[PDB]
Design a protein around this ligand. Structure first.
Ligand SMILES: N[C@@H](Cc1ccc(O)cc1)C(=O)O
Length: 309
């Protein structure tokens, strides 16, 4: 039949995707069966666009702000690493054109203002990081990529520059109770490793250790609650869209975790890391770990984009 043509296009996309899967890396897992599970998960969602002959669309919540711990990151400004990440994502969507001419698009949805209170990063700073990452797209000429923001939603606070209200509304209409968040996370090793990892980044950013520890553990459920709010917001705004995630996801999840640079850390993101030229291949590493490597910093446009080794 003709499903043979359609099934062949959808699989090539899924296979390209899988090459950049972000996952909890654990050898006891039969990777083969994980993928066989994901085939069933995403192939139908992909074939939706193909049957319609519509360009395939992805949503990805990412790039909310640069981590304020200069132990991890070079600067508040977006660094080369997102540049390299942004440039990767856009070319991913051009490749698909080589099979499937409508192509693909990715709506990067910024989550910077949603949890901005709990990160101790100014709403002023956040807004500039956003404006800059829009800036990068045009410098990059990354057409297949566009941006989605809290301000865009009609249902969100009218106009802008009342984030505290915007956050309240978002929590009201789309969030869940931190009590229900803590309960849901415990069930899985999946949910457990989110909790732990979210807290480790919150603690690492904030440098009384027992105080700061219980503190990061509470902010974690907070930040996670805000993120799933933004998640249900997009979950309704772009329902049939394929759902990319910046975090490792289970093979059963609707969300498909994805990487954008080489790194041995599953959870590192461009905002938490600097870019390193090591063996003539860029890698996402932490600013501290790379200085102990005797890396030399290189500056472009009067700002420090990356280190070299
Ligand atoms: N979303 C980040 C958490 C984070 C985001 C922005 C920050 O400035 C700091 C922490 C993560 O993957 O862990």
């Amino acid at each position: 039949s003709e499903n043979v043509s359609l099934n062949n296009i959808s699989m090539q996309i899924l296979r390209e995707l899988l090459q950049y899967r972000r996952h909890l890396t654990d050898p006891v897992k039969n990777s083969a069966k994980e993928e066989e599970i994901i085939k069933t998960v995403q192939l139908p969602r992909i074939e939706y666009f193909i049957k319609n002959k519509k360009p395939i669309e992805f949503i990805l919540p990412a790039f909310p702000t640069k981590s304020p711990n200069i132990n991890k990151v070079l600067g508040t400004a977006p660094d080369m690493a997102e540049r390299l990440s942004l440039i990767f994502l856009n070319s991913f969507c051009q490749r698909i054109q080589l099979y499937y001419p409508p192509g693909a698009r990715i709506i990067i949805c910024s989550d910077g203002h949603v949890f901005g209170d709990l990160i101790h990063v100014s709403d002023e700073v956040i807004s500039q990081y956003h404006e800059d990452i829009k800036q990068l797209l045009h410098e990059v000429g990354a057409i297949n990529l566009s941006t989605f923001n809290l301000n865009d939603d009609k249902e969100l606070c009218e106009h802008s520059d009342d984030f505290n209200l915007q956050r309240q509304m978002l929590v009201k209409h789309y969030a869940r109770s931190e009590a229900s968040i803590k309960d849901e996370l415990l069930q899985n090793n999946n949910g457990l490793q989110l909790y732990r990892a979210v807290t480790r980044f919150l603690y690492e950013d904030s440098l009384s250790n027992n105080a700061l520890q219980k503190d990061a553990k509470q902010r974690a459920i907070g930040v996670i609650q805000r993120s799933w709010a933004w998640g249900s917001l997009l979950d309704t705004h772009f329902p049939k869209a394929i759902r990319l995630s910046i975090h490792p996801q289970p093979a059963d999840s609707i969300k498909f975790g994805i990487h954008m640079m080489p790194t041995r850390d599953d959870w590192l993101t461009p905002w938490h890391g600097v870019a390193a030229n090591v063996n003539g291949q860029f890698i996402l590493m932490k600013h501290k770990e790379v200085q102990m490597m005797g890396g030399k910093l290189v500056n472009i446009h009067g700002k420090p984009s990356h280190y070299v080794i």
